[PDB]
């Protein structure tokens, strides 16, 4: 199917700072990936983003009733919807599951990669640090970065490239909003 | 900012496909099944805590459809440029033999929001227990999509997520097999 496609897309964003103390509402209209007109509650009128959107900015700005609908949106829409979903979105907390397993940068050589798997957690913000015998190791650390699983959970792999010596104890340390004390997992050579 | 809630909607011709959804910090709260004209909560429990009038979504889609006709004329029937997706296959958690897990196929950074996705087990299409999301918004106005496949890890089975998109010349396969 090589028929041309034509896509009409619109979003309305509610941005929250300090709970609902400060709120910004942004309505956006797009055609084929080009944003052409928007309403920003900082301004309180529509503005053309491209020339193709100018007729609508002018047209919608001439409708005072529509404008006042949008000017109130931070209250009637943003703050309202925030409250509706607060208990299972804003207040959603799922503890990370932490495991450590050894791996290799090179298959023919010995295990030289300690993987700290941190998974199933919510929200997204996470901090993972590696320690060797109680001393933080900042060198040789590589990660997947934050992985979104698309299902209100996240994960990450944080890997330490190191040559384990007998008797060494490695510790993976995880900080996350669900805990007020770091989670730790030890791995021994 | 602390949080962002996004309502995202589109209508696409000539496919006549439309979607309406709410996003919280990158996750889907719900979308509206256009066929059944019903709210579909991303996690089942959400529906016990909140509700939504799907007719409001249907009304917006009709507007989107009208706005599409207007814009297509204004732009002199300029077609959308295909942007092919990036595809990543991963598991829900570290893999252990004979321990139930889930394969995730993450389809990212593409437009238009139309894709064919097939899970392959040893080269064979599999549909048992599979699930998927609708098209999720991005800050750059391209789209995201997730497909899922529960599975029992083994040494004999290999998997691929096969993705077809008009921006791709051939289907894109991303592989997974047991890490040894």
């Amino acid at each position: 199917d090589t028929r041309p496609r034509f896509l009409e897309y619109s979003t309305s964003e509610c941005h929250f700072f300090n709970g609902t103390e400060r709120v910004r509402f942004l309505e956006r209209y797009f055609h084929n990936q080009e944003e052409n007109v928007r309403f920003d509650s900082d301004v309180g009128e529509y503005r053309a983003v491209t020339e193709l959107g100018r007729p609508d900015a002018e047209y919608w700005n001439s409708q005072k009733d529509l404008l006042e609908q949008r000017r109130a949106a931070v209250d009637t829409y943003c703050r309202h919807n925030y409250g509706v979903g607060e208990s299972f979105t804003v207040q959603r907390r799922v503890h990370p599951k932490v495991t450590v397993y050894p791996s290799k940068t090179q298959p023919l050589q010995h295990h030289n990669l300690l993987v700290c798997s941190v998974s199933g957690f919510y929200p997204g913000s996470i901090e993972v640090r590696w320690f060797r015998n109680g001393q933080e190791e900042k060198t040789g650390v590589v990660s997947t970065g934050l992985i979104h699983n698309g299902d209100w959970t996240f994960q990450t792999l944080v890997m330490l490239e190191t040559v384990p010596r007998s008797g060494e104890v490695y510790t993976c340390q995880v900080e996350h909003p669900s805990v007020t004390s770091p989670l730790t997992v030890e791995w021994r050579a | 900012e602390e949080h962002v809630i996004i309502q995202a909607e589109f209508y696409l011709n000539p496919d006549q496909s439309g979607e309406f959804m709410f996003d919280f910090d990158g996750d889907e709260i719900f979308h509206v099944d256009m066929a059944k004209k019903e709210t579909v909560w991303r996690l089942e429990e959400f529906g016990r805590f909140a509700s939504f009038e799907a007719q409001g979504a249907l009304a917006n889609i009709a507007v989107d459809k009208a706005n599409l006709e207007i814009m297509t004329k204004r732009s002199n029937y300029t077609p959308i440029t295909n942007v092919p997706p990036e595809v990543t296959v991963l598991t829900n958690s570290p893999v252990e033999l004979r321990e139930p897990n889930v394969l995730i196929c993450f389809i990212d950074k593409f437009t238009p929001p139309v894709v064919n996705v097939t899970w392959l087990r040893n080269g064979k299409p599999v549909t048992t227990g599979v699930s998927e999301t609708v098209f999720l918004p991005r800050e750059d106005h391209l789209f995201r999509k997730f497909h899922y496949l529960p599975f029992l890890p083994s040494t004999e089975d290999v998997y691929d997520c096969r993705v077809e998109h008009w921006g791709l010349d051939e289907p894109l396969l991303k592989h997974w097999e047991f890490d040894t």
Binding site: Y29, P55, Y59, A73, H80, G85 | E9, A57, N60, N67
Partner: peptide, 13 residues
Amino acid sequence: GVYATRSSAVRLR
């Protein structure tokens, strides 16, 4: 509670 819809408007014809 009930989620509120931002009702989109029709462009200029």
